[PDB]
Amino acid sequence: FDPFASTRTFNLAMTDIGEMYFMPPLMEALAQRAPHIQISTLRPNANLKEDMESGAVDLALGLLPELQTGFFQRRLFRHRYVCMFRKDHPSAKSPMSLKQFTELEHVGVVATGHGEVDGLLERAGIKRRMRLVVPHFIAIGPILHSTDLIATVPQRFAVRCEVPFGLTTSPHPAKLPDIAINLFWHAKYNRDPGNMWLRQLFVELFS
Amino acid sequence: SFDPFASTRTFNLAMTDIGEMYFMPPLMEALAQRAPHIQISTLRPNAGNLKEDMESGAVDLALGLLPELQTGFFQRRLFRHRYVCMFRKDHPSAKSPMSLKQFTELEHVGVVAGEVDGLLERAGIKRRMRLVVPHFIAIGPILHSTDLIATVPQRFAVRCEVPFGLTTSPHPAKLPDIAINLFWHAKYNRDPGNMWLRQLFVELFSE
Ligand SMILES: O=C(O)c1ccccc1O
Ligand SMILES: O=C(O)c1ccccc1O
Structure with a gap:
């Protein structure tokens, strides 16, 4: 998987807050790192869980307590x-x-x-x-x-x-x-080159 | 009567997110001097079963490009924009x-x-x-x-x-062009307080 060459589309579930918090920096990051990738985001309420299995959504971000079955997760941060x-x-x-x-x-x-x-x-x-x-x-x-x-x-x-x-x-x-915001991915894709890439970029830009 | 300056009623409004940060800011500023004890609540047109809720009286008015609302629904165009x-x-x-x-x-x-x-x-x-x-x-x-x-x-x-x-x-x-309208259920056409809110909108919005 080469980021600078990739034309893949990644799909991300996140809240509205999460949208105007994460996307702005992310887009700026990607502009120089992966200039041909496409990003799409959606709300966790239109649905998920299944979609993460199916590969329809790649990652999800938030205080999603629902997710805890075939789901790896890493804490990015807490805030008050x-x-x-x-x-x-x-x-x-x-x-x-x-x-x-x-x-x-x-x-x-x-x-x-x-x-x-x-x-x-x-x-x-x-x-x-x-x-x-x-x-x-x-x-x-x-x-x-x-x-x-x-x-x-x-x-x-x-x-x-x-x-x-x-x-x-x-x-x-x-x-x-306190508010514990986490990064979630489906186990089935734990070892996906591109997915791991995106994962790390988040962990990197946020922590 | 109704009396705006005295009323402690709660009005409920269906509107989009755009409509929320377009309409609310000015409206709240208006109300601050006109009806200082009223309460306002807003929701998304997907939120309840709006149509039913407007009959019920659970929602008083609705704002947007809502084509769904035909039949027992009076409506006045506020504005168009491109x-x-x-x-x-x-x-x-x-x-x-x-x-x-x-x-x-x-x-x-x-x-x-x-x-x-x-x-x-x-x-x-x-x-x-x-x-x-x-x-x-x-x-x-x-x-x-x-x-x-x-x-x-x-x-x-x-x-x-x-x-x-x-x-x-x-x-x-x-x-x-975008045609933004004001909608109310017929059953409430002759409600003192509702007519009041209606007019305030018509007033604050147009050109
Ligand atoms: O509440 C959330 O889900 C959230 C998500 C991303 C950033 C800040 C947040 O509060
Ligand atoms: O849908 C609305 O209520 C609206 C309001 C203001 C401007 C654009 C809009 O779509």
Whole structure:
């Protein structure tokens, strides 16, 4: 298998967060390393497991607990939930006190586990004033920029939003779980030249 | 009556991801001064069984190019817009107006989400498809960090140009206009609060 020569198409399951986290650097990497490969990505919900066997999908990335049968996996990284708001929010502060967190208004994302973030808050007596609720993360960044709403966001998602949308963060005041993002491949392809190649490239660019 | 300034009702809205970061930002800013205690929730048109949910009253309004919704559904057109071509502000060699000849030549990111790609292929135009993603969240970053170009809806481009440092070109191929509509179920045509939300949209969106 020669990367610089290959015209193969690799297919990857990953979340939306995982999409705008992973792809940008990856594409930049590939531009110089494998200039003729093609990449396609899809969501873990449109389905998988079978597809990984069939060779329809090559790798998958996320907090996929479902996968644990004929599935090798390597941890890339963990990261924490953070609290994100516009740089000049009228009254938000870092580190945010849990007391203040209760008090402000939030946008919540329904969405990988995650999470069940909102479960832990509610059980700890903390009832957020939930002004908006969205299914996934695309609009989050703009929304914070144009309003005084705060959000509970995964750390590496925050990172890629701070500049474009002019927002900052705070360590999260509540006790929430760490986020363990993993790389998964089907055993049947453990010894596939090209697949191992992609695997290592990920491990390389992320860790 | 209804009273917006007093109401604590929750409105539920079906819309795409593009529609989410297009509509929500301005809407939330609008509501902040007009209805400060209302709550909004949004979901994807694939999410529930929308059609049924709109009858039920589980979803109040829906926004998009939803052709499925015919029959017991009133609808008003908000706007149309065209497909554009989008690339980073200093792309090494991309130009505006992009010639169809150059379009064929550069490398693209394609979004899976109404067959644009069908019409290209039928017109003999085989793009060099370096990446393919399911929806739009990562598009903006991706163009920023690479020399890839994309075929994007106009009003989506608008909200990306600043944050990610990209510009556009009128699209060199013949592609359909995009007709975005507002839909509500007949059963609720005469609902005070629903009519209120309807009008607010009609108001904030048009030209
Ligand atoms: O939550 C995920 O699945 C995830 C995936 C990739 C990068 C960051 C993430 O939070
Ligand atoms: O589908 C939508 O709701 C939409 C909204 C704004 C711009 C383009 C779109 O497709």
